[PDB]
Design a protein around this ligand. Structure first.
Ligand SMILES: *C(=O)/C=C/N[C@@H](C(=O)O)C(C)(C)S(=O)O
Ligand SMILES: *C(=O)/C=C/N[C@@H](C(=O)O)C(C)(C)S(=O)O
Ligand SMILES: *C(=O)/C=C/N[C@@H](C(=O)O)C(C)(C)S(=O)O
Ligand SMILES: *C(=O)/C=C/N[C@@H](C(=O)O)C(C)(C)S(=O)O
Lengths: 265, 265, 265, 265
């Protein structure tokens, strides 16, 4: 009967809440709008880094990439400060995950190559991981402002949680590459008020946030209980009824994570 | 059903969980063995300090009390450093709440005066708050050693929660005296791994812990939601099956408070 | 003295360092190459929006400005996503201060009006604050790429400090317009590795950075001691011996700010 | 001329200040009352843990130590909650450093073995490292209330900084034991408003604090530059002119640390 509390949070925040938690040997899966489509936003930056790491040897992280002023089309708090110096693949992976750097994600997508600047190649990496519903059709910041009902650049809480499970807890990556992604998400600096704020301090939380227009605000995370049991939590939400200028509500994601924590205790 | 999760941690930690959260205008009351009798242990020092504040004026806190080395009976991290100087009533209140000092509580009990070192006077104060169930018959450290089934020095999560609601949230004390009591519990240094560990960091938590033999571990608390809504959480537990030297499981209290936080979210 | 440490980092980083801390009532004035001219770079946007605040009332902030793709010339993380909808006056101020948007600054210069994109109007506001030395002649991205020795688009560490002192601590703007200017500089997102990284955490730091070619890296800041004492710190630097594409060294600005924080404590 | 700022801090805070920083290869040695005697306070718990580490193998840290209520003679936030279950030697080393547990330090002194609870063995360990000035004669908390002028339980900022240098940067311990002591001092929870508050955030600071009567406030630490250069900072202070109940001033230690940070920059 956890769907009642989730439905009450939707009424309180005027939002559509989507929550999925994969099942464990001891607990059942938590599902609220798990198979509904929400916008990817910056949450695609976590499997994108894994895609770059998967198709390249570890030595590729030192390849320097140079870009111009016209490449910075969205908020890039790190790419903005290295236009003259350039950036390696590893620095692009660090900025895309920890600071949600918009330009870093577009260069990482271009590093994947192929049509669409790497969007079709990234979606192919999800299909190889069993993901059958997610899709990425544009770059930043276009993928954030898709109209409601448009299935472009959307995923499901059920789909993105399984992808995050194989990248961190599964064997989709070797231990050396998987340890790089886990450390990057563990030091994320944009999710202090989302899933991290809903879980107690003794719980470990690595995450990658995502914000867009129409009040969109998601956060995919892997949590560790104080005893050490790992759970994957996928929380996504939008407020498309409020319009394009709808303000996201980070408290809804923090409140939903507090509901999930009581069930996982 | 929260009672099912409240019935698993008993089997998981081999304990007897007692939870009570007084109902508010928006939320219902959380009950699990709420009317079952649990030992006061060191939690009685919260209504004990409020008793001294109730009968005595503000200037009574500056009254010095002397004591010899014979009066130090239980754990007294502060009393073992003022045997030559003595402590004023205010210091004994600060030591009894924040550090759970055993000798300070015995001195505050004798400060109430009466039969048995101020125990009957203490129970008499509990009766004025409408609590006719709880009782205190012994002094430190004998009240922690009462065998199970015995009703001496016992209380219930139902009756101690309403008492804390009257003292901290109600009008049991005038505002200037109530501000002093809340500050001491807000700076408690013995409850980091109990209710404070089970609630998210953005929740304010004041508490007074209680430990004892037979695996007794209690924590009565008044928590505040990130929006400012106040609740009262009373969690008590023991493991009488493990014998006299049963080990108290602090993780059971912290894990129980997370369940309460989920429903209260 | 401080001048010898200020003469060491220049050798450590192969740069030309310029510091100025205007004297307050308590301590003296820290000066090192204070009157030597350094490039304005993106630091001119701090007094720019203050000029737009001064000669227009508060209702002018709501004025909409429509622009095309050809107007995007320098880096513009915020201005590049509002080509169809346009931006307001206040939105251009927030983007030019917090994100150092080049397009927003070139539009703010045009909003002040006048000849040559209104650069003389900008300097037409500096002498009114007493600044005789500083000058601005070009728009982005041309003011950043002036050759060394040229005096166009230059100020001095002595010249832009007292203006920042007048604009944050003096009486240059009314309180209604002062609150907005200070808030925008406190939420700056382009200078976490400069003066902010040099001062301890308990020091409030508002700033507006500036970076350009020839290894030019500036940061003007108003810091507050843990006790509430305000100070104006202006650190400008270039590397005019390494070519047009010399790498700017942010570490020198953070080390110089630490060398300023020592005497101020 | 850095001794001029240390004197003004002595004048402003009404306290005697002791500061020593051992000279590295690039910088010189910073001294201010470095050879004067200051009380040990809780700073002796850093070499005490290293003493137990040095005299015993790694698996000795798993030995369970049991104690009674009488062993809690000072503030012991960790030992007070483990009277029933007991504490291992590894847990005693953690609590003595991170939480400055009083009972844990006394038990570790007994683990060293020797006359008067093992204080003669701890002093002998300091003589082994080359320290011929420091001395420990009392236990907790008697070593904190010594009168001014007494050499009992005192060291010097010059001697304690050289002891801490070999224990962390030197090779007084093998890398396995040395990594445990460094990790414990890195996660200290009692020095937030002392040396840590005086250094920029991008400097890594491990430390152990000390506080006692007569306004005594010490903090020994090892800091790391943003580039990775290590320095040892020993800051001690008292206010013995203010009497037994003289309040300590943590801001004096934080302000003196900011002066050292600017010189080491
Ligand atoms: C994730 O990829 C984020 C984009 N950032 C959003 C934000 O809330 O800052 C936008 C859509 C507003 S942006 O293009 O900066
Ligand atoms: C508060 O009054 C005390 C509970 N005392 C326990 C403790 O953990 O300190 C005992 C059982 C150890 S005690 O009889 O002091
Ligand atoms: C102020 O806003 C500065 C722009 N300066 C440079 C920068 O790194 O941001 C450039 C390279 C964009 S300048 O191109 O002419
Ligand atoms: C280590 O230096 C401290 C022991 N405790 C002191 C403190 O300030 O925490 C005292 C002075 C309170 S004590 O004598 O326990």
């Amino acid at each position: 009967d956890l769907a009642d509390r989730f439905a009450e949070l939707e009424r309180r925040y005027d939002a559509r809440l989507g929550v999925y938690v994969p099942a464990t040997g001891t607990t059942a899966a938590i599902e609220y709008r798990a198979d509904e489509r929400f916008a990817f936003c910056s949450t695609f930056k976590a499997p994108l880094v894994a895609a770059v790491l998967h198709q390249n040897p570890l030595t590729h992280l030192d390849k320097l990439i140079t870009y111009t002023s016209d490449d910075i089309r969205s908020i890039s708090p790190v790419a903005q400060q290295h236009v003259q110096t350039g950036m390696t693949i590893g620095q692009l992976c660090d900025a895309a995950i920890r600071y949600s750097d918009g330009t870093a994600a577009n260069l990482l997508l271009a590093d994947l190559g192929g049509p669409g600047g790497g969007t079709a190649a990234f979606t192919g990496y999800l299909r190889s991981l069993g993901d059958t519903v997610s899709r990425l059709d544009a770059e930043e910041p276009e993928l954030n402002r898709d109209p409601p009902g448009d299935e472009r650049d959307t995923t499901t809480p059920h789909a993105i949680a399984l992808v995050l499970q194989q990248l961190v807890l599964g064997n989709a990556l070797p231990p050396d590459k998987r340890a790089l992604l886990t450390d990057w998400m563990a030091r994320n600096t944009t999710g202090a008020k989302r899933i991290r704020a809903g879980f107690p301090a003794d719980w470990k939380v690595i995450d990658k946030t995502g914000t867009g227009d129409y009040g969109r605000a998601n956060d995919i995370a892997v949590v560790w209980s104080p005893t050490g049991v790992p759970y994957v939590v996928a929380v996504m939400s939008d407020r498309a009824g409020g319009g394009y200028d709808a303000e996201p509500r980070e408290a809804l994601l923090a409140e939903a994570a507090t509901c999930v924590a009581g069930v996982l205790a």
